[PDB]
From Swiss-Prot, chain A:
The gene is FEM1B. GO terms for biological process: apoptotic process; branching involved in prostate gland morphogenesis; epithelial cell maturation involved in prostate gland development; proteasome-mediated ubiquitin-dependent protein catabolic process; protein ubiquitination; regulation of DNA damage checkpoint; regulation of extrinsic apoptotic signaling pathway via death domain receptors; regulation of ubiquitin-protein transferase activity. This is Protein fem-1 homolog B. GO terms for molecular function: death receptor binding; metal ion binding; ubiquitin-like ligase-substrate adaptor activity. It comes from Homo sapiens. The chain holds residues 313 to 470 of 627 of the full protein. Belongs to the fem-1 family. Coiled coil: none annotated. TPR repeats lie at residues 32-65. Changing residue 30 to A: Prevents cleavage by a caspase-3-like protease.
From Swiss-Prot, chain B:
Ubiquitinated by the DCX(AMBRA1) complex, leading to its degradation by the proteasome. This is Elongin-C. One of its GO terms (cellular component) is elongin complex. Belongs to the SKP1 family. Its main location: nucleus.
From Swiss-Prot, chain C:
This is Cullin-2. It comes from Homo sapiens (Human). The chain holds residues 95 to 188 of 745 of the full protein. Coiled coil: none annotated. Belongs to the cullin family. Neddylated; which enhances the ubiquitination activity of ECS (Elongin BC-CUL2/5-SOCS-box protein) E3 ubiquitin-protein ligase complexes. Neddylation leads to structural rearrangment in the complex that allows interaction between the E2 ubiquitin-conjugating enzyme and the acceptor ubiquitin. CBC(VHL) complex formation seems to promote neddylation. Deneddylated via its interaction with the COP9 signalosome (CSN) complex. It comes from the Eukaryota. The lineage of its organism: Eukaryota, Metazoa, Chordata, Craniata, Vertebrata.
Amino acid sequence: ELESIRQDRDALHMEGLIVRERILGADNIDVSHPIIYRGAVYADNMEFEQCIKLWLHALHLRQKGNRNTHKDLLRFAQVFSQMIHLNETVKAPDIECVLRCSVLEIEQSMNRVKNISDADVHNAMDNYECNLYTFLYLVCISTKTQCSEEDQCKINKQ
Amino acid sequence: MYVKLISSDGHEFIVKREHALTSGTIKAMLSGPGQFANEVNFREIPSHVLSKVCMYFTYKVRYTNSSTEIPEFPIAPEIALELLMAANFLDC
Amino acid sequence: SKGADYMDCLYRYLNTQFIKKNKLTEADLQYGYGPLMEIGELALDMWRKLMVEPLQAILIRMLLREIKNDRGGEDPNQKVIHGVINSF
């Protein structure tokens, strides 16, 4: 099989991740560097066809162990701004539902963290401030795009 | 097209029908088995308050949707509370 | 029917101030998430549950044959039938 495409560049590239997932395990560093980096160099000229497809799968199971997804949300907004700037509506009407479920599922955390932390530092407050700022831009993106009314029902329920 | 208004003290007042429909309660008292076929009897309102309550209607109806700058209603400090607890009842 | 709206006026204060202040919003009604109810519209939800639902066999059956008889030739009183259908 590999002899068939030893001269091809794409089959090795998207096969490496599948090979490494088998032995890496469920809970380890698997999507941190490679999944994001492969998606970035894809999307720089891809016209954003499957950059969301590649990026979303990481965050689907990233939530098992929860770290600071602060920066993990600042770059899902600029790209969405950029297709709409390039008059590209690749975003499927159900795409933003996942990222809006994620922001709500993280927002409640910093409240409890602040309650637990007697004094902490200013940055703990800053995370709480900035996450709402990031949510507002996503909301504006939702308003500008036109989608189905059932999608609006999902968005309003969220 | 004229409606009477009797106060608890006794003094009776009379004003136009259309000038006395700005309050929902006075409209409710005239709709039902109370078609009065009109004289509405208030059991807990003095006379001095009811005077200014009647005066307010003309002020409201006349200077509405008018470019001319509107003046100010003069209200004496002594009685100010009673107009409040009466406008609560009348919903004006 | 005329009983309810002649009583709704007598309870205007309750509807304005006490009720409608602790009830559910229209937004709460829609999209799920989120019962105190206004007098005069509460007397119309005790006519559905205890007068027509326990009786929605004979009312339908006597109608669906009177209409057939009218089709076959019959003079039923229009007002009586029309009121009953307009009730629903």
